[PDB]
């Protein structure tokens, strides 16, 4: 129901988002993502199941010059990157994850240990064991990265990729067969719905059959729960003070004594009643939101809370609260993601085909080209540089950006316009 997570971030993940508040907002939304995904999924153990974070560790670019940090090396394989996180003592947490901004080869985004219901080790519910080769590793770990083929992945795919590797932690292998991978089915009704979470390959934007688990995944996770969550999972209750996120019942949350660099917040090591509470005379804390400074004051007007995006106009701070003002959209149907998708009401989803009443399709060196189609007929599937759509595009052939799914989600397209499986 509630499993106390421990999330880490390296300096590559901190450097991309460019303050500690930005990365904290990313890891806060990732936990709540898999919280909602797993709660709305019916598991055999109990009807619901959520997550909770117990502590965080935000490594900044100042830690790149730290000789004791093994994550400072820019070139680190995805297997050795997970092995580094395992070698730590994580017995106070059910699971422990580390988020990075590395471009792993062959389109690898996440990597986690498979959870065995019994007779093995790894995944969910595993304490540090001695094993072999003498290093005490904690196999209750997993990694994620937000860049693929030189392109940063959107948060929707980034939130799902968390839920995918956590599925292996919960004891779910990859989906197999037609009954649990409708994307490769010879039926238009099942193919439109798409594959599931535990699909072994690339996924992005279908949002119906891909966001939640499968009938196959529920069976495999059912055994791990019915035998391991009894001795592994903990209770639901009020949110803890010190996890770096501002929950209900607390006005601020900077962390513990050795983490809190906030002059506006009592750390988690302070006595009850003042821990995670605003210090007297102070009216905010950077842990609440990005719209307030270290001098504990609601930020002044005309300051960038949110920058102008493709489909989202800039949100601009002022002194009404500590949060961004919710961002609002610019003119509708503008081109986003380098002429690949459209801007309708604040989202860069779908494809560019929907701008003229068309749908994306798989071409049939041309796989990384955008192949549109007349609605509901895949036989009318022609390229953007075809003579069919010559009236609209005037001929310019829109190519898929690197890191985009291709050939019915069998791989990604690289910087050389090759659909690598």
């Amino acid at each position, epitope marked *: 129901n509630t499993c106390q997570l421990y999330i880490q971030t390296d300096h590559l993940f901190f450097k991309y988002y460019g303050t500690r508040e930005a990365v904290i907002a990313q890891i806060s939304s990732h936990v709540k993502a898999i919280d909602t995904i797993y709660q709305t999924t019916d598991f055999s153990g109990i009807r619901q199941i959520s997550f909770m974070v117990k502590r965080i560790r935000i490594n900044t670019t100042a830690d790149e010059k730290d000789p004791t940090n093994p994550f400072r090396f820019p070139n680190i394989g995805v297997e050795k990157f997970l092995e580094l996180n395992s070698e730590q003592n994580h017995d106070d947490y059910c699971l422990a994850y580390v988020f990075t901004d590395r471009d792993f080869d062959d389109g690898v985004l996440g990597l986690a240990w498979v959870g065995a219901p019994s007779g093995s080790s790894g995944g969910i519910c595993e304490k540090s064991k001695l094993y072999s080769d003498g290093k005490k590793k904690s196999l209750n770990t997993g990694i994620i990265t937000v860049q693929n083929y030189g392109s940063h992945v959107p948060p929707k795919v980034s939130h799902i990729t968390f839920a995918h590797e956590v599925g292996h932690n919960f004891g779910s292998p990859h989906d197999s067969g037609t009954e649990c991978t409708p994307g490769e089915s010879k039926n238009l009704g099942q193919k439109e719905n798409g594959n599931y979470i535990m699909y072994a390959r690339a996924t992005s934007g279908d949002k119906l059959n891909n966001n939640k688990f499968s009938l196959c995944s529920i069976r495999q996770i059912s055994q791990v729960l019915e035998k391991k969550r009894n001795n592994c999972f903990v209770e639901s209750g009020q949110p803890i003070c010190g996890n770096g996120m501002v929950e209900q019942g607390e006005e601020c949350d900077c962390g513990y*004594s050795d983490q*809190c660099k906030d*002059e506006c917040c*009592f*750390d988690a*090591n*302070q*006595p*009850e*009643g*003042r821990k995670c509470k605003l*210090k*007297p*005379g102070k009216q905010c804390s950077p842990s609440q939101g990005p719209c307030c400074t270290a001098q504990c004051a609601f930020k002044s007007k005309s300051e960038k809370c949110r920058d102008d995006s493709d489909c989202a106009r800039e949100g601009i701070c002022n002194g009404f609260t500590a949060l961004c003002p919710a961002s609002d959209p610019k003119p509708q149907f503008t081109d986003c993601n380098r002429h690949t998708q459209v801007c309708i009401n604040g989202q860069c989803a779908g494809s560019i085909c929907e701008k003229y009443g068309l749908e994306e399709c798989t071409c049939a060196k041309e796989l990384c080209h955008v192949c549109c189609m007349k609605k509901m007929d895949p036989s009318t599937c022609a390229s953007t540089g075809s003579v069919q759509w010559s009236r609209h595009f005037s001929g310019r052939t829109i190519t898929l950006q690197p890191g985009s799914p291709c050939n019915d989600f069998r791989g990604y397209c690289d910087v050389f316009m090759r659909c690598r499986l």
Partner: antibody
Amino acid sequence: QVQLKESGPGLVAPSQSLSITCTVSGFSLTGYGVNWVRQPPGKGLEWLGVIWGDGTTDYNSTLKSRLSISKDNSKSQVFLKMNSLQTVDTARYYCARDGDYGRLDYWGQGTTLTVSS
Amino acid sequence: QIVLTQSPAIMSASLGERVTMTCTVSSSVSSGYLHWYQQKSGSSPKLWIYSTSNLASGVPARFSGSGSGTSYSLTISSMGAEDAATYYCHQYRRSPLTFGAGTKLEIKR
């Protein structure tokens, strides 16, 4: 157990500096705040300032010009410094721990301060 | 600036009588942050009631505290010979830290 003991000069002349040492015991100054409360002869409790476990300070509005509060976490000592002491600064200066929900659960014996020429 | 008005500022009571003190704050504070203290002549104050309704370690059961929002109370069920002192209410939920005016509880003869 928890102890607090303030070390003051006792008798100072007006227009002179002040320095009181609040030696504490039983707890760590990193997880508890320490308030300074003076009490004039025949009057009520009067707040001076406070230094938090993380090193942050909050002072009395009319005394921030002269008051100054620092501490030493390793030696369990909180320091109270004042400038341009007037004759009306004669009082008994206490230091008390800021406990759960800001309760002043443990007080010191207090040190008498007399300001007269 | 939060003010803590304490009334009655002067109380006379005989042995066995029942007294009730009051503190009215200028702005509503959470109940968990108001505390009462007892101070005798020539001695430092002692935490008496903490978190409004919780008696400190050692103070007798004849004491009690109630209140919420703006009004707060301190009640002695049976006035004893040892309860003649001055009582204060305390708040530091909001700056600055302020004490009450102080209630002088004198025993009546």
